[PDB]
Subunit: 383 residues, 3 copies
């Protein structure tokens, strides 16, 4: 639906994934933090190519398509919320209920035949762990757990994070996250030095192809993902050689991190533990449009009470956000940006030359192709 | 030519209008004020996607296509008018007569077989009320009055105006101008408050007078237009309601304006009276290219002598230009800009949901489709 | 390959040239001066649409495609030359030999089956006369002499020059260089005024079409070019007339230059003598992409020894660079930029109206169509 059929015929291992330039419809995605949306302060964002409005009304979140039914303007150009329960388009005052999107009033013509006979698209919205998730899909949503990595929703897991807009397609971000050999780019990170991490340059893979990953397609809340098992039977590379000479060494530190690495539909990485042995990292790559993603980064730590939560918040602000979320992952940002040109014409999916550690990436591409809940298309965006 | 047949086949009754992305050929259009084009000082502009040169020679205006026949450069890159009657291309000195476009000389090769056997396109130009009009069409032009609204050319009518380039397609500007319900956007205007205008939020169409428009096809100079009668025959909304609760009032005021509102081919609105009881507003939305128009605004006031003309100019500079042309119509500008996205892929023409007051807009779309004098195409532009 | 088949059918005689939007493959092209690339300091550039890296190692130049075989990143985003003889991709440390492009190591997986089984594209590089030439083509190259004008490689010919990036297609540059009538644009040049040049406004051609040029398809080293002979039979125009009135004169200077003007594949102009009677100008119009070229200008003067070399370097800096390479050719730069719009859609090749002096340009388009060593296509650029 999105890519030249002639390219899709050349990527038969994972053609639906290559078609999914706008992401997968009918999944939950995080778009902002709960603390960023105040009572009665609607916010605009673009998700899977669609402009949306989110509002908090008596503490509850609601999501309306930011596109008037009448002349297709963004209501957000000039927000008019004239009652708690409604928003009025600024142009001809078509008025919609947040709760169900029904056209309930038109201020410029209270006799219109359109009143009560039209509905603006709404999307389900849930807050969990101080994160705002939108179900960009149609019909009854699944539990949020389906589209979140294991442990993210644990009662005692405290989540703190950072969000920003990155100019690469979401898939280049997912693959960069889940790529076992990309950790070469992190060899000079401040985090690796100041937090004393064991970080190899890469891994010489051991065992058979089928042992390099574990597909999870039998999780009982319907979660679908892949674990990277390259470190299980693989030999970590700490001495980089050219023609047999050592030219580079890996990070010779004491702290073992990233024993468990997994990627989940719709596009969320879990790294456990990271960036410290007592915490884990969960990061989403949320499709905004064909060219752009939200890099929605979270660190989780079990905290038993308000005192542990406060101690974690203080370490997050003082150490883990600047050292790890910024000082380690900033190199991922320009890596993603560097892949844009090759994949921009959809040709890089045919012309890439993969090697052994990309087994993790190919397993993800297949999992995503088989288990996605729909391919978002320009028809969903416009129609 | 300009729009996919898949869209046009879905808009029967006004498909020519939807195809007319670049405007209608074979009409007059205003492009600048007389004072902006000085004797022997050529000016460049783009009209209906064509680059044009205008010059004043012995007081009279001429217009050549700003594209050399030879290698297709704009002559205006380096203007060389070496005699009163001619322009010489800067590149190889092909020399054209302003009066008829004829290639009369080539300075680089006075023996060329091209001399006297080629002609650069010319367009008629006329000045009226201090406004420069170009006939962007072929063959001998109709009278200017065919393409101007009633009274604009009246002997006593003093015209003052403002012109600027706006980044929307021309049709979004025309529809914004003629839209009976869009007056909702003007509810907070300083003009409405300070000049004591009566301005409803909108109109409930009137049950005792069923015809919401009057087509003028029967005019004496052949002008073609539509009068909006909703406001004359409708029930004005001064108390806008949501769930039956008043959430917004209209503007009460002594001064009744816009008794008669009409749109005319090729795309010029007349509002009478406006912004004061003895004035009229005439505004054009002149196509520059697919994405851009001139918003050519004028205010007319009958003036018997130089003292009345002087008083009107003072009034215009101190009050009407800042309060009305800027203050009031600035909200029309961002309204037009806000419609761009929905119409940019041509899908808005199919996906819009109209309501009752849009009968005025559909009447215009059908009038324009029936009585335009030609659809401008890329073949006219490049060629 | 590059242009709508419809257009190519309307230009039959020179269709391969109209197709050659990215330039001709399997030719040498200058891209920088020798003194701009230091030992072990790689430089990036784009040539015929391909991103390339050039390095100097033990004084010798090497050229690798700047696109990793693995995920298609530019290695130049973060250059890692970890041994004298190699470059390591910053992403997964795929390590390539400069000499033959062979993938000789991967630091992230020294056990990979890809090692020794892949090679990055390399291009030959040759330095001559202080200029860096890349053979943008396949297989063992021809002698550089084939792709340089006569006398450029003469033992005693001292070359000095200037390079810059210009926003036009390379062919608009070539035609502007070789066009006999375009000298009209140079009539006010500081070089003409200050160096007392004789410069007509143009020529009235004499003799047959065949007599207006001399095709060199028969040169001993395989050079392919056209001499402009318009001034052999041609009558110089020094009095430009409109309606038989003189409106402009040529330059009546004592100094005679540009006796011999020739254009050579792959797109290099030779003007002898210029800008003074014992110097030659050799200038290349090197394709960067569809929209861009290097304007690689050089001035040659024969010098017997180190002392003549130094005097020429001084007059180049104080006189010839500013007065000629800038004061004369700057008008050529904006002339090229002015042709972009008409040729951007490929329609100008069909819609232009040529005149008699364009027989030089037609002879070049025919020579280029017949004798080019290959049409660069998006398949070469992409894969
Ligand atoms: S575009 Fe929203 S009410 Fe008209
Ligand atoms: S482009 Fe105008 S005379 Fe050649
Ligand atoms: S992209 Fe260069 S080594 Fe992976
Ligand atoms: Fe990373
Ligand atoms: Fe308005
Ligand atoms: Fe020149
Ligand atoms: Mg709801
Ligand atoms: Mg005329
Ligand atoms: Mg009032
Ligand atoms: Mg008055
Ligand atoms: Mg080599």
């Amino acid at each position: 639906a999105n890519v030249d059929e002639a390219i899709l015929k050349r990527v038969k291992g994972w053609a639906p994934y290559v078609d999914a330039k706008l992401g997968f419809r009918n999944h939950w995605y995080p778009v902002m933090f709960s603390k960023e949306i105040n009572e009665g302060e609607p916010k605009t964002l673009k998700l899977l190519g669609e402009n949306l409005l989110v509002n908090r009304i008596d503490g509850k979140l609601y999501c309306l398509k930011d596109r008037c039914l009448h002349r297709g303007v963004q209501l957000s150009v000039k927000v008019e919320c004239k009652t708690k329960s409604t928003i009025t388009c600024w142009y001809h005052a078509w008025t919609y209920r947040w709760e169900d999107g029904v056209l309930c009033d038109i201020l410029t013509n209270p006799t219109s035949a359109q009143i009560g006979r039209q509905k603006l698209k709404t999307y389900p919205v849930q807050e969990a762990k101080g994160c705002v998730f939108i179900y960009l899909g149609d019909g009854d949503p699944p539990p949020l757990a389906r589209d979140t990595p294991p442990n993210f929703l644990d009662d005692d897991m405290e989540i703190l994070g950072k969000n920003q807009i990155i100019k690469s397609n979401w898939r280049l971000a997912v693959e960069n996250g889940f790529d076992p050999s990309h950790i070469y780019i992190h060899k000079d990170s401040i985090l690796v030095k100041d937090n004393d991490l064991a970080l190899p340059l890469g891994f010489a893979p051991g065992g058979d192809r089928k042992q390099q990953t574990r597909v999870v397609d039998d999780d009982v809340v319907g979660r679908k993902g892949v674990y990277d098992l390259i470190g299980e039977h693989g030999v970590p590379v700490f001495e980089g050689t050219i023609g047999g000479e050592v030219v580079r060494e890996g990070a010779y530190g004491e702290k073992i991190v990233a024993n468990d690495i997994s990627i989940w539909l719709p596009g969320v990485l879990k790294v456990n533990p990271f960036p410290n042995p007592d915490m884990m990292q969960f990061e989403w790559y949320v499709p905004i449009d064909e060219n752009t993603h939200y890099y929605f980064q979270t660190l989780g730590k079990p905290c038993a009470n308000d005192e542990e939560r406060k101690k974690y918040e203080q370490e997050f602000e003082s150490k883990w956000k600047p050292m790890a979320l910024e000082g380690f992952n900033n190199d991922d940002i320009w890596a993603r940006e560097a892949m844009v040109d090759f994949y921009a014409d959809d040709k890089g999916w045919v012309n890439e030359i993969l090697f052994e550690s990309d087994e993790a990436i190919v397993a993800w591409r297949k999992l995503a192709s088989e288990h996605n809940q729909g391919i978002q298309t320009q028809a969903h965006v416009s129609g």
